[PDB]
Every structure is written in structure tokens, then in C-alpha cells.
From a paper:
In [name] the multifunctional heme enzyme [name] is indispensable for activation of isoniazid (INH), a first-line pro-drug for treatment of tuberculosis. The homodimeric structure is predominantly α-helical with each protomer (∼80 kDa) composed of two domains. The N-terminal domain contains a heme b and substrate binding site, which are essential for enzymatic function. A covalently linked “MYW catalytic triad” is formed by the conserved residues, Met255, Tyr229, and Trp107, which is essential for catalase activity (Jakopitsch et al., 2003, 2004; Santoni et al., 2004).
Furthermore, no density was observed for the loop containing Tyr229, a residue that is part of the MYW catalytic triad, thus suggesting that the crosslink is not present in this [name] variant. The cryo-EM structure of the [name] variant reveals a considerably disordered structure compared with the WT protein. The MYW catalytic triad is no longer formed and we observe no density for the Tyr229 residue (a residue part of the MYW triad). As expected from our heme binding assays, the structure of the [name] variant before heme loading displayed little density for a well-defined bound heme.
Residue numbers in the entry:
A (entry chain A): 42 to 127, 141 to 193, 238 to 271, 329 to 345, 378 to 740
B (entry chain B): 42 to 124, 141 to 190, 238 to 273, 328 to 345, 378 to 740
The structure:
């Protein structure tokens, strides 16, 4: 069955720090001016065990950082240098450095910085560095064939055309063997892979030019290495330490900084009133807010709602974010509201489109809950900005596309896992525990967010009202579930009379037929457990909205 | 290698109830005078989806509360009721009205008990509080007695359980027909075991003559079966719990005196530390008393103070030969000196003095290290006499292998580190607490027979992280491989043996998942962190069996 132990991976009980280890006020107090000297003193020595290769250990740590940062696979984001644990007899050699710092320098930061310092101290000038990789708590030779193989194995790493050549040349070496590769004939016997640069015509547009402009090789290799070790770290607000560069690069998905005073509380109330007074259905605002804030990968920290890219080309064309029913009308209405509030702004208070998307989501939930008999307030922390189309990298936002969304009953053709391990994977990416997954599924089914507004999972008698009616009616035993005669995957449920009453997908009934999920649904769908469900859903929704805010603080 | 995910089982993140919800304050506020009516209304019906019985679902919920309570393995404690999916769809109309105030284990077991009580019977009592996550004349007799001794049942409760279970599914129709006409199978025949085995028959004939005694014996046997792994009598919630206590609960006398606090604690700590007792004696005694606890059936703990009693003093791990008699005599003398000469109606019990000696020894050791701390101590324990503890029942709590005391006895089903992992799982200790407790106990001096296996400290009797600093040191090479077999040794670059280790010590310096939790306490600036976390872990271990304070 489902492995629901993946949702609570790396809990706070196995963390030897507990609750007072914000890894941003410690490493910001690091002494980089002296840590580099300690690294140099450790690396430029021999040891009885593991004897030195001509002294310097620079090659060792450079190849180690490379083989630890080359695991990042774009198709799901996991890998990189900041995750897992990728020889580990080095942790018995870098220990004389970690001993002097301890909790102010995680193992990932120390290993990657050892590699970077080795590069810096072997006749080079690297780009920059940024600490903040938290430590996981489990720490035939054919030219064309080789060329296509390296192109594919770096395309999975998101290295395109010039970073591939720069990385290969630098790793094998700012020219020291480029002049070797053009000096004479080359033969073979029982390495010629580097000849792929000399053979492949796409490489020749840059590689042969690099013989005349060696400084270009150095610059592009510095940029390629900086990309290589920082690809699995996130947007540039987790980049801690006094080493980060002063410029931002287009592969980071940059967002403009705030140039306007953030909205207070009276302005929040006025905007919340102005949104739900424009004639927007709750199923529109909630769907748009979830769409903007459920394209987030908690492994590569890339995506999220910040930047407000749901109106941009990469994220509006997706079939999940159906741009035919309502994702142009909603965006036009919110843009008009933003312009109206910006023009007659009370002072220097301005609202950015990402703020309005998340605010529309929160106001829609508040209105639905107020219509459900309760009186709740959804927390909203402003500060998001809007990223222009020139800063979105249309070709990069093509893997964040959800091939299958579990909270919206979207199931695209061609899926690896049938219909509910993809929901588990999505809930793992958003870093959602099992109770939060269950409460979010229930709230989104009841509110109305299903793709194409299908009635697959809407168990509520009267929609647009945040109640636990997806949980009460799921456990009801007056209805029996059998696969539909039209075998599309639906599980139409019939009552005791013999007429069809509800209709479900594999997600709803895997909540209703598992063991742990059944226990959670029984907790959330009892009698006199509506207020608990409302509070838990508001907390889960706020966490989802603010997922990509703390690391872009 | 090791599976460190077993230590953090059932975290607080997967609990939908939050960290502010306690079962005791909720379930005591339900009225069992109406839950019984709801259960009876649900269990007397015919749901179309589930083919009902004649007219009553009872005979299916006794057999459901039995097979969910006859899986209690005494050898480790796991199983029982506190640890079909078609009944979960039938008892829902009852759990719906209650929800948070009635866990599934309590509801299913209480449905079984109510069905038994409503089938012409008068049961003993109930306590809520179970949270949720072939010719064989003698062969059958020996098989049933073995499979019921695996659940710790006597020779009278076995017959009572068999007769009752075969009756409810007094009437005594299972005994009158047992001897009616040449009753013998010539193809049930397992029931002949009572009719052939002399030990069973001796009481079975009396029951056939004294039917009224069978009702009492079966009531007590059923009460034992239901509440076998629920814990001491202080965990029984609800208004149904009986007013008497039984010898299988490991009862302790109630407090009949005031409780020492905040000045008598200081006086007793000074008197303990001024009696000429080594830190390696007080810490070892306190750990021995408070590390015989099974966090699966909640049986054991320091409460009751049985370290001086026969079941727990004879164990080889406690080592009664060298130092467990001098310590106990000294603490008993201190108790007798502080009881009679006490200022008023204030008194101290021997279990309190054992735990207080442990805390005072740790305080003295830490003060010798260079810090100045106070180990919190919550009194309340009492002393259980010898007549209130069973020699035969406690023979299974004996640790055949202790990892924190570096004790490894013959007959090891698993290597020396999986036993440590299982022991730390029983005490409900997370991985950081396991590592810190191992380091602190090695440094303080608690090893069985005072062996220098794992003592990496240059000068003992000082609570420091020197077990962590010297373990990660790479100036020492371990002559045998750290993961093959035997006891290792540490040799420096000069070829001279410096440290001596064991398979339990050299896992916190060779396991990539556990060597990460020794680089947090083994650092340069992480001495006070280690001291504070060791005090927290020691307090958690001491207060494991304090169910009357929570």
C-alpha cells in the first residue's frame, strides 16, 4: 500500500537541536577570513592514513564536490549538494575544521566550501559562495555518441551549451589542454571523448573561439561552477554569509526587490473587501491561489507563489492551470484591482500582483468560512513582488509543470504511478504532513477547485462553504462504491436505493479506504469537530501560501 | 546498517491532535451510562452490507476483543490491545458522537466487554486510556498451556478463559455436557485436555461442583486479558475501574506522608553526597532501578523501589556481588535517619532516595567538570513490599543485554548494537538522547563489573563529553575492524594501546547516521549543550514510570 512514512521524513525529534537553531543568525556570524586559512592548513598536509597525492588535497575535494553536486536531477529536484549524503573518509579529515565551529557550519557547507577554496587556491578566481545548505539527518569510444551522452547527462543537470564546454574544460584543467586538443593528429587503441568538442559542430561555435579569448573560458567556467554548486539551494535569499556576489543571474528565477512600503492592516481589510466585491466565485479565487502556490518543489526550493508568474507565459499555458474557463478573467480582474489601488494609493502603499493572488485566496477562504457558519481570519504576510517576463526563463519552467495534481483531481496521460502515489509525491514536495494533506484535500474538494470543475470528489450538498462534508459523506456507510460502467477510473458510489448519489476518483477513496488516512478522516469528520477542521485547514493553507516566503524572507 | 528510524516511531507531526491534547482530561469527562446504551443499540441490528448474526453482533466483538488482546508477547511486551476493518465501519455511528474522547482501541475493547456483560454475565470492570497509533490427548494440553504462558496466564485463568470463551459465543453448559455420555471424538477434542490433564482436572471438577466460583475466576481472567499491557493502576481512567488492586498489576502502596520539596531535597542531596558513596555507585544503582522499564506494556520503572527486592537484586546485570548491597544499606540507613527525625509529617521513600542519589551524583560530577547545574527531581514514588512483587512475573523484565551499561550476556539473538537499539526503543528514547545517555554513562562510570570498556576519559567522575571527543579522534587506530566481532582496542601512532572499546561504543564513531550525532556534542564549544541535554535525557529516563504525576 501507500508508504505514509515518507511524509514525516526527518522529524524534529531526531534533530539534536530541537527549537533554537535558526541556521541564519549563526552562520551569518561566521569568520570566513579565518575559515579559509584553516581549510588551507588542513588540505596542505599529509597524513599517515590516506596518504597525500603530491601533498595538496585540492583535486580530492574538487572532484568530491563535483560528484556531490552532479546528482541534481531536474525531473523532480532531489539531489544536489544540500540533500542526503554523497568517499566519506573525508569527514575524518575535515573534522579538525568542523571541531572549531560545530553548529555554525553544516557538513554540506563545509564540504562544498572546501571544494570552492581548493579551486580558488589552485590558480583561479571563483565567482562567489553562499552558506545555508542545512544538513540532512542521514549524513566503444565514439565521438558523436560521447557528445550526445554528455549533452544528455548535462541537460538533466540543466547545463545547456556553454556551461557544458566550460565545465568539461575546467574540470580537465585558463587554457591548459585546449591548446593540447589542437596540436596534432589523434589516434586510438584498445582519451578521445574530449575530441567531441573538436567534432561536434555546435560546440565549435564557442570552443574554438575560446582559443583566442582565454579570459572568456575563465569567466564562463566561474559562472558554470557557481551554478553547479548552488543549483539545489533556492532563490537568492537563503544565500547566507559574507561571500555571495552582488549580482543576480537568470537561472535563480530572480524577483525584483520591494520598492514600496508594504500594506498594513486597514489596507488589507480594504483589499479583502474590494476583491470579493468584484463578482469572483470562491472556486475561482481559491483555484487561482492554489495554482500559483502549488507549483513549489521543497527539494530544489524552486517555484512557489513569490514573483507572481501565474500571469506569465510559462505558467499560464499549462493544462493544469486551465487557461480557458477562468485564469484570464481572474487575472484581469486582479490586475485591474491592483492598478486601481496603486493609482489612488494612500501614500506610498502599493500592492504587487503576487500579493493580490494570495490575498484573493485568503479572502475567498474567509468568505466561504463565514458562509459556513464560523468566523475565521486567514493570516496574510505581505512582501511578495512581481517578476517580469524577461526574468522567468520560459524554457526552465517546463519541469515544474504538474503532470498530475492530487488536490485538484488532475490526472494527465502518461503517469509513472497510477493515481495516488503521485498525490503522495506532491504532498512530499510541498512538505506537508499527513494531517495537513488530508485536511487540504478535504477543504479543496469542498470549496471547489477541481480541474475543469469536474464533480469528482465534491461530496458537499451545497458548495462554496468550507465544511468537513467531504469527510462526513466519505465515511458514510449508506453508500457503496463500485467502478463505473464507463471505465474512466471514476468510482461512482450508489446508495441503498440503487441510484447514483456521489462520484469519486482514486484519491478520494484512497483517503476513504486506507488505514492511517482513514484514521485521519475519522478524526476530522466526527461530530462537533467542525471548528477543529476549520482551524486546521486555515493553518495548512497559510503554511502552503507562505512556503516560498520564509526562504525568500 | 542499523535502522535508526525505529527510534522516532509515531512522531508528533503525524498526530492530527496537536501537542496540546491529553487523553486523560478528555475521556474522564464522558458519561459511560449512555455510551453503553449507544453500543447496545448499534450491536443489536442487521446492517444490510454486513450479514448480521441471529440478532446480535456480540459474539463477533468478543472474538474481536480477544484476538486483539491474545497477541501479547511477554518476552518483549509488544502486542495487546493498546498497540477487521469491517467493524470500523460498524462502530462508526458510536465513535462519531464522541470522536476525540474515545480512541479506537478503547471503543473496540469496550464494545467487546459490553457485549460480554450483556450476554448474561457480570464482568469485573473497565478502564479507558488505551491510546492508538491428529490425536492429541496431552499434546493439545501442553500446546494451550505453552501458548497461554506466553501471555503470562496461570493454570486457573487458562481453564477459566477456555470455559468462558466456549460458553459466551451462569450457564455452565460447557461442563455439564462434558460428562454426559461416553464423550469422545472418533473422526471438538481439544476440550478433553481439561478432562484428562490432572492439573486442569483438579480445579475443573471443583468448578463443575462450584459453578459460582467459575464466574469469579473468569471475570478476573477476562479483566487480566483486557488490561494486561495497559500499565500500572494509575493509568486506568474512567468511572468503571474497580476499587481493588490485583497482584499482576505490580501494585505500589499509596502515599501516606507529605512530599519533600526544595529544602529537604537539598538536605538529602547533601547527606547522600556526604556518605562516602562513589559517583559510579549511585549512578549505577539509579540506572539499574530506572532502566528495567518496558515502554510497550508500561511495566517496570523505578516506581515501587524494587531494586532491593529479590526479583531485581538477583539479576546478574545489577551485579549484587560487588556494589548493590553497600549502596542499598547506606540509602536505607539514610531513610531511617531522615524518617524518625523528620520535621513534622514529612517522609522519604526508598525509591525516592535511589533516584535522588542518582541526581545528586550527577550534580556532583557536573560540578567537578566545571559547570553548576541542578537536576530536576519530582518526588512521589513509594516502596512496594516483597509480598506485592512476583518473582515469576519479573523474570522476563531482566535485561539479557544492556547497551548503556556495556553488559553482554550469553545467549544473544542479535549482535551487540541491535540489542542497544532495541533497549533504547523500549525506553522510548530518540537517537540524540540515546547517544548522549551512552556518552554520559560511559564517562561517569556505570559499566557492568566496572570494566574499562568505553571509558575514554582521562579522569573519570566528571560529566564531560570526553567519550565523544576521544571517539572521533583520528590519532587512534582500532586494531580489529569496527564491525566484525569481539572487543576492539585503540592504538595511537606509537603502536601502544591507548583506548579499549566494544561493539556498542564503536557504533557512535563508525555509523554514518550516528557519527553525525556525536559531532554535535563532540565539538569545541558544545560542552554546556552536552551537559544540559544529558540532564534532560536523565530526567526523562528517571520520570518514565511517573504516571501519577501526569
Amino acid at each position: 500500500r501507500l508508504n505514509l512514512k515518507v511524509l514525516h521524513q526527518n522529524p524534529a525529534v531526531a534533530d539534536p537541536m530541537g527549537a533554537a537553531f535558526d541556521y541564519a543568525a549563526e552562520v551569518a556570524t561566521i569568520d570566513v577570513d579565518a575559515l579559509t586559512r584553516d581549510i588551507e592548513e588542513v588540505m596542505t598536509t599529509s597524513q599517515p592514513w590516506w596518504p597525500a597525492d603530491y601533498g595538496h588535497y585540492g583535486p580530492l575535494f574538487i572532484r568530491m564536490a563535483w560528484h556531490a553536486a552532479g546528482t541534481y536531477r531536474i525531473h523532480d529536484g532531489r539531489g544536489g549538494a544540500g540533500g542526503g549524503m554523497q568517499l566519506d573518509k573525508a569527514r575524518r579529515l575535515l573534522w579538525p575544521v568542523k571541531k572549531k565551529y560545530g553548529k555554525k557550519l553544516s557538513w554540506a557547507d563545509l564540504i562544498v566550501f572546501a571544494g570552492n577554496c581548493a579551486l580558488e587556491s589552485m590558480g583561479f578566481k571563483t565567482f562567489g559562495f553562499g552558506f545555508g545548505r542545512v544538513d540532512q539527518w542521514e549524513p566503444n569510444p565514439d565521438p558523436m555518441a560521447a557528445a550526445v551522452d554528455i549533452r544528455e547527462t548535462f541537460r538533466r543537470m540543466a547545463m545547456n551549451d556553454v556551461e557544458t564546454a566550460a565545465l568539461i574544460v575546467g574540470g580537465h584543467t585558463d587554457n591548459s589542454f585546449l591548446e593540447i586538443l589542437y596540436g596534432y593528429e589523434w589516434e586510438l587503441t584498445k582519451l578521445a571523448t574530449d575530441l567531441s568538442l573538436r567534432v561536434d559542430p555546435i560546440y565549435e561555435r564557442i570552443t574554438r573561439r575560446w582559443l583566442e579569448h582565454p579570459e572568456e573560458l575563465a569567466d564562463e567556467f566561474a559562472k558554470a561552477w557557481y551554478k553547479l554548486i548552488h543549483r539545489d539551494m533556492g532563490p537568492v535569499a537563503r544565500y547566507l554569509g559574507p561571500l555571495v556576489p552582488k549580482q543576480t543571474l537568470l537561472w535563480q528565477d530572480p524577483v525584483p526587490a520591494v520598492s514600496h512600503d508594504l500594506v498594513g492592516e486597514a489596507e488589507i481589510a480594504s483589499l479583502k473587501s474590494q476583491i470579493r466585491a468584484s463578482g469572483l466565485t470562491v472556486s475561482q479565487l481559491v483555484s487561482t491561489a492554489w495554482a500559483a502556490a502549488s507549483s513549489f518543489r521543497g527539494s530544489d526550493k524552486r517555484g512557489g507563489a513569490n514573483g507572481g508568474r501565474i500571469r506569465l507565459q510559462p505558467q499560464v499555458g499549462w493544462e493544469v492551470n486551465d487557461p480557458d474557463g477562468d485564469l484570464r478573467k481572474v487575472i484581469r480582474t486582479l490586475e485591474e484591482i491592483q492598478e486601481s489601488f496603486n493609482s489612488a494609493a494612500p501614500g506610498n502603499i502599493k500592492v504587487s500582483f503576487a500579493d493580490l493572488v494570495v490575498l484573493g485566496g485568503c479572502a475567498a477562504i474567509e468568505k466561504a468560512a463565514k458562509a459556513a457558519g464560523h468566523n475565521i481570519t486567514v493570516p496574510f504576510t505581505p512582501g511578495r513582488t512581481d517578476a517580469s517576463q524577461e526574468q522567468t526563463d520560459v524554457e526552465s519552467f517546463a519541469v515544474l509543470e504538474p503532470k498530475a495534481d492530487g488536490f485538484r483531481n488532475y490526472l494527465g496521460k502518461g503517469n509513472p504511478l497510477p493515481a495516488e502515489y503521485m498525490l503522495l509525491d506532491k504532498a512530499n514536495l510541498l512538505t506537508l504532513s499527513a494531517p495537513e494533506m488530508t485536511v487540504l484535500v478535504g477543504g479543496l474538494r469542498v470549496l471547489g477547485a477541481n480541474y475543469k470543475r469536474l464533480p469528482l470528489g465534491v461530496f458537499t450538498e451545497a458548495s462554496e462553504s468550507l465544511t468537513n462534508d467531504f469527510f462526513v459523506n466519505l465515511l458514510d456507510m449508506g453508500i457503496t462504491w463500485e467502478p463505473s460502467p464507463a471505465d474512466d477510473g471514476t468510482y461512482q458510489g450508489k446508495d441503498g436505493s440503487g441510484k447514483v448519489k456521489w462520484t469519486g476518483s482514486r484519491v478520494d477513496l484512497v483517503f476513504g479506504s486506507n488505514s492511517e488516512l482513514r484514521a485521519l478522516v475519522e478524526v476530522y469528520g466526527a461530530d462537533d469537530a467542525q471548528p477543529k477542521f476549520v482551524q486546521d485547514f486555515v493553518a495548512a493553507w497559510d503554511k502552503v501560501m507562505n512556503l516560498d516566503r520564509f526562504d525568500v524572507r
